[PDB]
Write a protein that binds this ligand. Structure first.
Ligand SMILES: *Cc1c(COP(=O)(O)O)cnc(C)c1O
Ligand SMILES: *Cc1c(COP(=O)(O)O)cnc(C)c1O
Lengths: 404, 404
């Protein structure tokens, strides 16, 4: 830096921003010959490139001025209409809600923090939860309450206990943030009883639920869940979806659905952060949904990832030593492993990398960075042949770690 | 709202967000028969649609996976490289600076507020200045100091006076925000002496300059100015450019160039707000600049807008009564009018709309909303025939206002 101590100019918030000793190490691991299970990326093989090509031609023929001009802050009206038709028919989400387009769901999470969170406001998250949601919220200085998951998603039981305990301190929760289907990073899904229980608590204790759902359509087995937002009779849920894993992440288009009063404030907050989400990509996504291509393409995404999930689940079972446990997702992109006898997976990553494999250590997914024996594995973005070999190398890493 | 008093959930900042009785009326005006001079949009006739089409085909043939996948937070590397080569050759901006891609310059302004501004930090702006910059900064609760413009841009001598007065109060400015070439909304340009003087003050008083430059290539007459950033030997300037008026706004791609220490902090702040700027548009913009298309297209944008500016300047001179004054821009999209005898242009808009013409009242462009006799006119987005008739109707509106 040529200004010298450039820190003299930074805000208090900027001074407390870093990231991340491990994400930086992982950035370097990708461009080498380690088998990395660490990534969070969808597989380019699932991008519908031929449909995209046809849509780009159609846009330049019929929609070029709309695609190329500034848009409204709220979003391109035909996309907003086609998404609400889609969510209503596909999920039973109520047309009483309003919808705003976002520059990905990441932007929705930042807007949630800006619109709802004063410093010290309490946000409930799952333990683990999506690391970039914590990153978005952290700028707004909440206090977190962490609710563990099991193989049926958030333990809403423990949420009730913590709400009663906070009540007894004269406090309350403002927002419960959940990624209830095929969680990033856990891979588990909140069952129907718990979704319903979570909404009674939302009514009883008067909080807002944010339901973040990037992965619902990436279902490989089992039957579709009910969206929490489909059960939302009080208008208490803000539902977030994204085109990132069902089209391609490169357009940076997502949507936020919820109470019109909430959406209106979100639109005003968004105006100042980026004016509008890129309209060219909104017009692409509109044709994609309205033209029936999304509906036709989803089965092709599922056919692609299913065997990758299966290969990884087969390899873990065949190779992992006693006492290692993992989730068994019915969908999405991740499998979450729990190690025995107090192994620290952040410490173990050095050894795993030496043996040719990488994963994300679980610690960074916990608001209180308090659990150290967990790992997130990704099965979408490495060749299948490499899934088996990677899981074997991870298994042998764990065996060595368990000794002396 | 289904939740009742939804305000009970909003943050302190959200509670003070409004939008805006004038913007809402002008949303209505655009969809009707009035001649509106109020817009801030570039003309779709200037979008390079054939070059865009060819670039889209090229992307789907050669670059599809990179355009469609997640990007790094900092931006698509070949775009960052081509913009730095472009800015170095075209403007003489130093290659010692780093560059980050933004989701438009609007996003750069929000990130400047996040990165630099604690509540109460002092930000200097021009009077008038870009209204959405004030909107971005306002979330971070700065105090503003307003420095009037004349026909040679910011009156930097009044800036020196105000810097001395603040020093005497034990205070300092953190950031000076300037739109020094073809300003939105004033249309004037800061001359070379003042650019140099601004930087001496930046060194003497130790502040950061933000140079926001959307319009520099939209020059219709005169010789190019030197970018403030081209004169910046201390690394004190953060330079913002954007593709919005030189390609099309629909891709929402801009860039921020400055000290590597500052850019690194900006990258971390951006990561949590949107992950990355849309990679598809970045690949489009990369081919646009790297393929020499931008260089070739700039003369065609100038040829298109110059007669529109000229028609509007001719009409004002022929139709405006005594005592009305306006700027005479050498470029950009706006002409800024000053009314005589204490007319309030926000009051007058009602009469103007009845007579078939709209403009933006200047009050919204002042940090202290203190000046009331100014208007912003746009010449880019109305047909030329309508420019003449619009200015005539505005002239007759003003004559009527001047009477009892
Ligand atoms: C994939 C991911 C996102 C997607 O964010 P975008 O900005 O839309 O790409 C959001 N939430 C979770 C939990 C994710 O894993
Ligand atoms: C046009 C305008 C912008 C451009 O903003 P984008 O977000 O890049 O579209 C920025 N600054 C000023 C002064 C403007 O007039």
């Amino acid at each position: 830096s040529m200004l010298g101590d450039v820190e003299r100019f930074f805000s208090k918030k900027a001074l407390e921003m870093r990231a991340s000793e491990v994400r930086e190490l992982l950035k370097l691991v990708e461009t080498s010959d380690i088998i990395s299970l660490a990534g969070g990326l969808p597989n380019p093989k699932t991008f519908p490139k031929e449909i995209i090509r046809d849509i780009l031609v159609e846009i330049m023929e019929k929609y070029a001025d709309k695609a190329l001009q500034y848009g409204t802050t709220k979003g391109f009206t035909p996309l907003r209409e086609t998404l609400m038709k889609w969510l209503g028919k596909r999920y039973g989400i109520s047309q009483d809600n309003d919808i705003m387009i976002t520059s990905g769901s990441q932007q929705a999470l930042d807007l949630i923090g800006r619109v709802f969170l004063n410093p010290g406001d309490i946000v409930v998250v799952e333990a683990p939860t999506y690391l970039a949601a914590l990153q978005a919220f952290n700028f707004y200085e909440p206090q977190y309450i962490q609710i563990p998951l099991d193989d049926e998603g958030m333990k809403v039981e423990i949420l009730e206990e913590k709400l009663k305990e906070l009540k007894s301190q004269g406090k309350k929760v403002k927002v419960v943030y959940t990624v209830p289907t095929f969680q990033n990073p856990a891979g588990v899904t909140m069952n129907e009883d718990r979704r319903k229980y979570l909404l009674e608590l939302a009514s009883e204790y008067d909080f807002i639920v944010v339901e973040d759902d990037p992965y619902g359509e990436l279902r490989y087995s089992g039957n579709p869940e009910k969206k929490i937002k489909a059960l939302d009779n009080e208008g208490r849920v803000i539902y977030l979806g994204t085109f990132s894993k069902i089209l391609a992440p490169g357009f940076r288009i997502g949507w936020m659905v919820g109470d019109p009063g909430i959406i209106r404030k979100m639109e005003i907050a968004k105006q100042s952060t980026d004016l509008c989400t890129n309209v060219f990509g909104q017009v692409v996504a509109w044709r994609y949904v309205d033209g029936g291509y999304l509906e036709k393409h989803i089965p092709e995404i599922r056919k692609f990832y299913k065997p990758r999930r299966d290969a990884m689940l087969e390899a873990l079972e065949e190779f992992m030593p006693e006492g290692v446990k993992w989730t068994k997702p019915e969908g999405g992109m991740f499998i979450w492993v729990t190690l025995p006898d107090g192994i620290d997976s952040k410490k173990m990553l050095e050894r795993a990398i030496k043996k040719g494999v990488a994963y994300v250590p679980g610690e960074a997914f916990y608001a209180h960075r308090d659990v150290k024996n967990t790992m997130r594995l990704n099965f979408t973005y490495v060749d299948e042949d490499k899934i088996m070999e990677g899981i074997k190398r991870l298994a042998e890493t764990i065996k060595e770690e368990l000794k002396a």
